[PDB]
Design a protein around this ligand. Structure first.
Ligand SMILES: [Cl-]
Ligand SMILES: [Cl-]
Lengths: 208, 208
């Protein structure tokens, strides 16, 4: 069966978080369109996500070489490996996140840090890195209260741009992006903006 | 006495991390120039930095209003408050960080998340937010192995740009930035690049 992983990075209620409403609608539409696919949800707010530091950096280096590790190094590699393996095994991955403080939630930042692994998501070559996830389909789902595609905030969008950039580095192509934006900044258009976004979400989900 | 806070976000050894070498040289130069200033180091890798989620978001909202909180909400606010208060009390703050995966370490991302607080680092007004840290001097110290000021990576620098953007939102002005870049990409120039950077660090530190 096709394996689809949904990575959710917002534990606020749907009633208050358009990004969660977006995620839920895409999820529901995907399941309706493809009921035989094995869909798994990874809720990053239910996971233990130790931060990447020296133990995880040295650890992954040593692990890759088959060298001895401290217990703390081994534990760090094992955490990263769990998520990385699940991500690699997925045929399709859907990221659902808000824009908070110009970027993604720090939980998703740590998750992405785990996915960067030589020999797994990219490889070094004498002419530069080559991404290894070319076959994997990725969808990015973001809601943000202000507009970031134009105007004074356009140069500081670091949420979608962040995720897209790292996925591109890993070799992902033809990614789908659904953005709902502006509903808090233009409150009189909030209902229209979200409705349109949720319809877009269902269309994308049906082709994804 | 003037109060200076150094926020360190890299637990790799100086011998291997130019960003740590940079931080240490700026620190040493600052202390030599201003030995009577009270300098405190906050090493984010020694701190417990719970991620920002619904408890911390609801919690801070409720706290601000003087409303009742769950124990988990109260604990989240208290963590954020500890760091926020220390940051507010500092006359000067120095951030030392690498560029990893296009951005700052996730520990520093969570730290910055804590600093965003209505009534503390900014205020809402009927004509938009006004930053409240205009009097605070900020220095940003970054090292990165590749070049991000020009070339194919220039559009994806999200480490300095991230920190600068949030500090600017809080109302910081005339910030000092010291960047050492390119030493891994141009290894034959690594010694020259780092030496020049450490000299720049000492100059800035003497005026800071
Ligand atoms: Cl560590
Ligand atoms: Cl939470």
């Amino acid at each position: 069966m096709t394996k689809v992983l949904f990575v959710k990075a917002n534990n606020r209620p749907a009633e208050q978080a358009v990004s969660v409403k977006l995620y839920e609608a895409f999820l529901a539409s995907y399941k309706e369109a493809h009921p035989n696919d094995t869909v798994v949800e990874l809720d990053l707010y239910k996971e233990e996500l130790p931060y990447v530091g020296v133990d995880m950096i040295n650890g992954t280096f040593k692990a890759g070489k088959g060298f001895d590790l401290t217990e703390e190094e081994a534990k760090a590699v094992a955490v990263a490996d769990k998520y990385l393996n699940q991500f690699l095994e997925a045929d399709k991955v859907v990221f659902g996140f808000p824009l908070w403080n110009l970027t993604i939630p720090a939980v998703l930042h740590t998750y992405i840090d785990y996915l960067n692994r030589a020999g797994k998501t990219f490889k070094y070559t004498p002419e530069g890195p080559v991404g290894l996830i070319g076959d994997k389909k990725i969808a990015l789902l973001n809601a943000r209260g202000g507009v970031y595609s134009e105007g004074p905030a356009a140069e500081v969008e670091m949420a979608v741009k962040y995720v897209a950039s790292m996925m591109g580095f890993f070799g992902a192509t033809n990614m789908e992006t659904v953005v709902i934006e502006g509903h808090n900044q233009f409150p009189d258009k909030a209902e229209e903006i979200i409705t349109a976004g949720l319809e877009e979400a269902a269309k994308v989900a049906n082709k994804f």
